[PDB]
Scaffold this motif. Structure first.
Motif, PDB file in Angstrom:
ATOM      1  N   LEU A  26      -0.832  10.173  10.171  1.00 20.76           N
ATOM      2  CA  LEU A  26      -1.023  10.807   8.870  1.00 20.76           C
ATOM      3  C   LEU A  26      -2.411  10.586   8.242  1.00 20.76           C
ATOM      4  CD1 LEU A  26       2.600  10.177   7.563  1.00 20.76           C
ATOM      5  CD2 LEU A  26       1.729  12.395   8.333  1.00 20.76           C
ATOM      6  N   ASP A  27      -2.767   9.336   7.949  1.00 19.46           N
ATOM      7  CA  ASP A  27      -4.055   9.056   7.324  1.00 19.46           C
ATOM      8  C   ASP A  27      -5.166   9.549   8.220  1.00 19.46           C
ATOM      9  OD1 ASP A  27      -4.060   7.838   4.725  1.00 19.46           O
ATOM     10  OD2 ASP A  27      -3.313   5.973   5.576  1.00 19.46           O
ATOM     11  N   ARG A  28      -5.050   9.252   9.514  1.00 21.10           N
ATOM     12  CA  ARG A  28      -6.116   9.569  10.449  1.00 21.10           C
ATOM     13  C   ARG A  28      -6.366  11.083  10.530  1.00 21.10           C
ATOM     14  NH1 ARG A  28      -9.654  11.193  12.744  1.00 21.10           N
ATOM     15  NH2 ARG A  28     -10.813  10.357  14.554  1.00 21.10           N
ATOM     16  N   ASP A  30      -6.844   1.413  12.390  1.00 18.34           N
ATOM     17  CA  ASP A  30      -7.736   2.471  12.845  1.00 18.34           C
ATOM     18  C   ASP A  30      -7.090   3.788  12.396  1.00 18.34           C
ATOM     19  OD1 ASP A  30      -9.229   4.375  14.299  1.00 18.34           O
ATOM     20  OD2 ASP A  30      -8.784   3.465  16.249  1.00 18.34           O
ATOM     21  N   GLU A  31      -7.456   4.228  11.196  1.00 11.44           N
ATOM     22  CA  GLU A  31      -6.870   5.410  10.577  1.00 11.44           C
ATOM     23  C   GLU A  31      -7.897   6.208   9.785  1.00 11.44           C
ATOM     24  OE1 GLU A  31      -4.944   2.703   6.980  1.00 11.44           O
ATOM     25  OE2 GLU A  31      -3.853   4.443   7.774  1.00 11.44           O
ATOM     26  N   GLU A  32      -9.172   5.908  10.018  1.00 11.98           N
ATOM     27  CA  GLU A  32     -10.289   6.675   9.482  1.00 11.98           C
ATOM     28  C   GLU A  32     -11.253   6.974  10.650  1.00 11.98           C
ATOM     29  OE1 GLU A  32      -8.485   6.217   5.622  1.00 11.98           O
ATOM     30  OE2 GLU A  32      -9.925   7.642   6.454  1.00 11.98           O
ATOM     31  N   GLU A  42       0.808  -1.215   0.000  1.00  8.81           N
ATOM     32  CA  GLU A  42       0.000   0.000   0.000  1.00  8.81           C
ATOM     33  C   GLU A  42       0.847   1.273   0.000  1.00  8.81           C
ATOM     34  OE1 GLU A  42      -1.652   1.842   3.123  1.00  8.81           O
ATOM     35  OE2 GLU A  42      -3.664   2.236   2.357  1.00  8.81           O
ATOM     36  N   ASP A  43       0.766   2.032   1.088  1.00 11.05           N
ATOM     37  CA  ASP A  43       1.210   3.426   1.070  1.00 11.05           C
ATOM     38  C   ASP A  43       2.714   3.627   0.915  1.00 11.05           C
ATOM     39  OD1 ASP A  43      -1.275   4.662   0.942  1.00 11.05           O
ATOM     40  OD2 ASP A  43      -1.081   5.752   2.846  1.00 11.05           O
ATOM     41  N   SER A  44       3.506   2.593   1.193  1.00 11.11           N
ATOM     42  CA  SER A  44       4.954   2.720   1.008  1.00 11.11           C
ATOM     43  C   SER A  44       5.489   2.275  -0.357  1.00 11.11           C
ATOM     44  CB  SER A  44       5.733   2.027   2.118  1.00 11.11           C
ATOM     45  OG  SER A  44       5.563   0.624   2.057  1.00 11.11           O
ATOM     46  N   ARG A  85       2.845   7.392   1.813  1.00  9.17           N
ATOM     47  CA  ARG A  85       1.969   8.226   0.977  1.00  9.17           C
ATOM     48  C   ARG A  85       0.977   9.123   1.738  1.00  9.17           C
ATOM     49  NH1 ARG A  85      -0.700   5.015  -3.788  1.00  9.17           N
ATOM     50  NH2 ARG A  85      -1.278   3.713  -1.982  1.00  9.17           N
ATOM     51  N   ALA A  86       0.558   8.683   2.924  1.00 10.18           N
ATOM     52  CA  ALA A  86      -0.327   9.475   3.778  1.00 10.18           C
ATOM     53  C   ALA A  86       0.202  10.868   4.134  1.00 10.18           C
ATOM     54  CB  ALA A  86      -0.677   8.710   5.049  1.00 10.18           C
ATOM     55  N   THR A  87       1.501  11.094   3.968  1.00  7.10           N
ATOM     56  CA  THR A  87       2.047  12.434   4.137  1.00  7.10           C
ATOM     57  C   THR A  87       1.426  13.370   3.116  1.00  7.10           C
ATOM     58  OG1 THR A  87       4.073  13.727   4.550  1.00  7.10           O
ATOM     59  CG2 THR A  87       4.081  12.312   2.619  1.00  7.10           C
ATOM     60  N   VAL A  94       1.333  -9.152   5.556  1.00  6.94           N
ATOM     61  CA  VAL A  94       1.302  -8.393   4.328  1.00  6.94           C
ATOM     62  C   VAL A  94       0.212  -7.326   4.432  1.00  6.94           C
ATOM     63  CG1 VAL A  94      -0.181 -10.112   3.165  1.00  6.94           C
ATOM     64  CG2 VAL A  94       1.135  -8.480   1.796  1.00  6.94           C
ATOM     65  N   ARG A  95       0.537  -6.088   4.074  1.00  2.37           N
ATOM     66  CA  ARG A  95      -0.503  -5.061   3.996  1.00  2.37           C
ATOM     67  C   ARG A  95      -1.013  -4.950   2.570  1.00  2.37           C
ATOM     68  NH1 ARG A  95      -0.196   1.214   6.238  1.00  2.37           N
ATOM     69  NH2 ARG A  95       1.371   1.497   4.602  1.00  2.37           N
ATOM     70  N   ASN A  96      -2.259  -5.372   2.375  1.00  8.06           N
ATOM     71  CA  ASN A  96      -2.997  -5.242   1.123  1.00  8.06           C
ATOM     72  C   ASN A  96      -3.427  -3.799   0.945  1.00  8.06           C
ATOM     73  OD1 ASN A  96      -2.846  -8.021   0.969  1.00  8.06           O
ATOM     74  ND2 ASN A  96      -5.043  -8.368   0.758  1.00  8.06           N
ATOM     75  N   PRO A  99      -5.874  -1.590   5.378  1.00 11.03           N
ATOM     76  CA  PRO A  99      -5.858  -0.176   5.737  1.00 11.03           C
ATOM     77  C   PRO A  99      -7.120   0.565   5.293  1.00 11.03           C
ATOM     78  CG  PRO A  99      -4.670  -0.507   3.682  1.00 11.03           C
ATOM     79  CD  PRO A  99      -5.115  -1.864   4.141  1.00 11.03           C
ATOM     80  N   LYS A 100      -7.333   1.756   5.847  1.00 11.09           N
ATOM     81  CA  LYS A 100      -8.257   2.720   5.260  1.00 11.09           C
ATOM     82  C   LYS A 100      -9.728   2.275   5.225  1.00 11.09           C
ATOM     83  CE  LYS A 100      -5.039   5.361   2.281  1.00 11.09           C
ATOM     84  NZ  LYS A 100      -3.774   4.820   2.862  1.00 11.09           N
ATOM     85  N   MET A 101     -10.136   1.415   6.143  1.00 12.45           N
ATOM     86  CA  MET A 101     -11.542   1.064   6.191  1.00 12.45           C
ATOM     87  C   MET A 101     -12.343   2.120   6.942  1.00 12.45           C
ATOM     88  SD  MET A 101     -11.561  -3.007   6.700  1.00 12.45           S
ATOM     89  CE  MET A 101     -10.481  -3.135   8.116  1.00 12.45           C
TER      90      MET A 101
HETATM   91 MG   LIG Z   1      -2.108   4.743   6.600  1.00 18.00          MG
END
Ligand SMILES: [Mg+2]
Ligand SMILES: O=C(O)c1cc2ccc(Br)cc2[nH]1
Ligand SMILES: [Mg+2]
Length: 715
Positions: free
Chosen positions: A449-451, A421-423, A272-274, A622-624, A327-329, A386-388
């Motif tokens: 960042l995302d949060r 937990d980022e939303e 994902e974001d990296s 990427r959340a930056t 693994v982060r999908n 992520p990002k749910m």
């Molecule tokens: Mg994130």
């Protein structure tokens, strides 16, 4: 085109071949059952995937209008909360429960320690992470500013004896704090020996044992003159290497060569974001590295084997030599043209990740060739999602995992979920989100960042937000951090699943990390994110100083955050900033966007040491972009700055970024021909289209611009 027809799908050939030739062989899944399953799962789950994404927009629209008709200074928390409850944003809290998640490895259920996150598309990094389970403390001390580079103790071309001596002393002190002697200090140890299953430390005046002999875990070499001693404290190993003939060993009172710490207990290989992955080619590169790690044959350097030791009483035993891999999908938003349907519509990337990373993960549940099985001995696949946004989205992922397991022939619940937990909609319904996944969940975690990006976008219409730096200490985020820990603990996470906290981004600022990152296990987090093997080793110190298991038991039953605090929008007061403060903040945000974007768009790099505006190296993902572009879009939205202010800052910052990148052999300057740089144009677009991106997400724009760059580089 060169796609492969499978039912309603048209699969990129590079992906179809990768799967057939590399991913499938060795799993005993019928190739055509797999593909029929791919087609079926995509056809069945796509409509709900889309419905969920529509639901986000609908809720956001209603909140936008809520603020737009308000004109009132503070906030009527009661009415605002009433509103969120009417529209289905805030759901009812479920009755108390306990998670039933089974078949999970010790590293996740019981062990507290550092957790590494690494771009799966970078093979060298991926391997170093997997090998970062054990790391040299001396190297991590001598190499960073944890030992300050004061006069005389500087790092030069070759070994500083003065500096290395401080390194030794620091480690000695850590040993006394972590595995105390009955009397005396390790600082005056002269030798180590094992007699009758007991560690015996020789002091100049006499000998001594451990205060707690149960911390003696093993050794190597002869009991009477060991090559190392293995200790344990809070579930984490400490190995003292004994070699009087090494560079450091010669100078040492007891001949100690190094202190090796069990560091990165787990690692997240990130899709994902990296990473930058915008097409079939990029996904295959990622998928192929993930395959190589699970098969144990990835080579760029190779994976390490397990470590053999001699038990205190004389028997033989083994300890794991590799970080256990997650693994982060990617999340629910994006599609990818790796597969399109009959109409040419791209397929959801999240759905694809589950099928392919899940498939590939089967190899990590079986003996390699390069050797015993690499990964989960308990039979689990660990996927970070992520990002749910909210409980129904967690249930949708659970149902996705359920359907894939069938296609894969795996027993139900093999595919475990790591809930980010980022939303905000997840934060305020966190308990429901955990419940929705009560039989699959193996972690939750928080970030910044995302949060914060979601926080800003959600209340975009409310008014001007505080500065990015300020956000880190706002009441909403401090409450969010605590609420996360409370929710996990209440659902029985202690001894069952990880409770994680965020990344230390400042890769060169290791002294500050050691000094301050200790707050995380003290807050009851059984894990936290680190950017490097070196950081993992240093952050491991924190788990020796703090009994996370004890902290969590003491937190039991507490509710340290209210829905009100969670819902406290970080609006700036009237007259918050001087003009120079406004400019600096604008410069700060334009700089992070440009510095990150240029490497993403031009080189397909999703994470690296990027110098910020004050030349501090940051390792952010990427959340930056999400937080920065949302903050500038918010200030632009409410009159804090002008579009000319934004233009000026980009122009003022682009040459600085150009300069901070030379540097790089492949780098192409942005200044002074701005509208000729696709990267510069991407940066501009992110800010100026920011308020219109779904929940402030940067991937739609970024992905489009990266594809554009790739197409130009090919003509
Ligand atoms: Mg994130
Ligand atoms: O949240 C962050 O700052 C963050 C996430 C992440 C993932 C991989 C790498 Br490399 C760096 C990161 N920073
Ligand atoms: Mg402020």
């Amino acid at each position: 085109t060169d796609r492969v027809s499978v039912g309603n799908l048209r699969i990129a050939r590079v992906l179809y071949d990768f799967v057939n030739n590399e991913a499938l062989p060795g799993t005993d899944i019928d190739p055509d059952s797999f593909w029929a399953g791919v087609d079926k799962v995509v056809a069945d789950l796509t409509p709900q995937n889309q419905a969920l994404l529509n639901a986000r927009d609908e809720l956001q629209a209603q909140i936008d209008k809520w603020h737009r008709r308000r004109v009132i200074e503070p906030i009527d928390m009661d009415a605002y909360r009433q509103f969120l409850t009417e529209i289905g944003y805030l759901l009812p809290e479920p009755d108390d429960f306990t998670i039933t998640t089974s078949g999970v490895d010790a590293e996740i259920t019981t062990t507290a320690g550092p957790q590494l996150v690494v771009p799966v598309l970078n093979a060298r990094f991926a391997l170093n992470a997997a090998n970062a389970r054990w790391g040299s403390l001396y190297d991590a001390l001598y190499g960073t500013d944890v030992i300050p580079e004061t006069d005389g103790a500087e790092k030069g071309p070759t070994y500083n004896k003065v500096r290395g001596d401080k390194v030794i002393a620091y480690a000695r002190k850590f040993l006394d704090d972590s595995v105390p002697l009955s009397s005396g200090s390790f600082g005056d140890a002269t030798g180590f020996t094992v007699q009758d299953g007991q560690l015996v430390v020789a002091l100049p005046d006499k000998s001594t044992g451990l205060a707690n002999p149960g911390q003696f875990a093993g050794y190597t070499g002869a009991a009477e003159s060991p090559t190392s001693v293995l200790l344990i404290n809070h579930g984490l190993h400490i190995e003292i290497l004994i070699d009087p003939e090494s560079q450091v060993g010669t100078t040492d009172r007891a001949g100690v060569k190094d202190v090796i710490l069990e560091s990165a207990i787990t690692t997240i290989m990130d899709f994902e974001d990296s990473v930058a992955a915008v097409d079939a080619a990029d996904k295959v590169l990622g998928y192929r590295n993930w395959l190589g790690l699970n098969k144990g044959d990835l080579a760029a350097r190779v994976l390490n084997r397990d470590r053999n030791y001699t038990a205190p009483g004389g028997g033989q035993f083994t300890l794991p030599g590799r970080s256990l891999m997650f693994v982060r999908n990617v999340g629910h938003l994006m599609t990818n043209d790796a597969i399109v349907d009959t109409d040419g519509s791209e397929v959801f990337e999240g759905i694809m990740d589950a099928l392919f990373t899940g498939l590939i993960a089967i190899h990590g549940l079986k003996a390699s060739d390069v050797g015993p099985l690499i990964n989960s001995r308990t039979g689990s696949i660990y996927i970070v999602k992520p990002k749910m946004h909210g409980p129904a989205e967690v249930a949708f992922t659970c149902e996705l995992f359920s359907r894939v397991e069938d296609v894969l022939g795996l027993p139900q619940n093999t595919m475990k979920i790591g809930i980010m937990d980022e939303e905000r909609r997840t934060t305020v319904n966190l308990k429901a989100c955990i419940k929705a996944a009560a039989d699959r969940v193996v972690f939750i975690n928080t970030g910044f960042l995302d949060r914060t990006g979601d926080e800003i976008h959600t209340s975009m219409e409310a008014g001007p937000m505080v500065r990015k730096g300020t956000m880190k200490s706002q009441p909403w985020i401090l409450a969010y951090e605590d609420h996360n820990v409370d929710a996990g603990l209440a659902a029985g996470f202690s001894g069952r699943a990880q409770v994680g906290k965020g990344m230390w981004t400042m890769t060169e600022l290791m002294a500050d990390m050691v000094e301050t990152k200790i707050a995380q296990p003290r807050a009851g987090a059984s894990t936290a994110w680190v950017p490097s093997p070196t950081a993992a080793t240093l952050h491991a110190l924190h788990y020796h100083q703090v009994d996370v298991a004890a902290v969590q038991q003491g937190l039991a039953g507490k509710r340290r955050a209210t829905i009100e605090q969670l819902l406290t929008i970080p609006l700036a007061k009237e007259l918050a900033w001087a003009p120079d403060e406004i400019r600096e903040e604008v410069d700060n945000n334009c700089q992070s966007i440009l510095g990150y974007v240029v490497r993403w768009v031009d080189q397909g790099v999703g994470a690296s040491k990027v110098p910020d505006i004050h030349d501090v190296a940051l390792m952010e993902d990427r959340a930056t972009l999400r937080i920065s572009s949302q903050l500038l879009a918010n200030w632009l939205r409410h009159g804090v700055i002008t579009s000319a202010d934004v233009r000026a800052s980009l122009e003022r910052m682009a040459p600085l970024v150009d300069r901070q990148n030379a540097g790089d052999v492949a780098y192409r300057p942005m200044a002074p021909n701005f509208d000729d740089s696709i990267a510069f144009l991407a940066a501009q677009e992110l800010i100026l289209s920011g308020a219109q991106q779904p929940n402030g997400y940067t991937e739609p724009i970024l992905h489009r611009r990266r594809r554009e760059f790739k197409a130009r580089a090919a003509e």
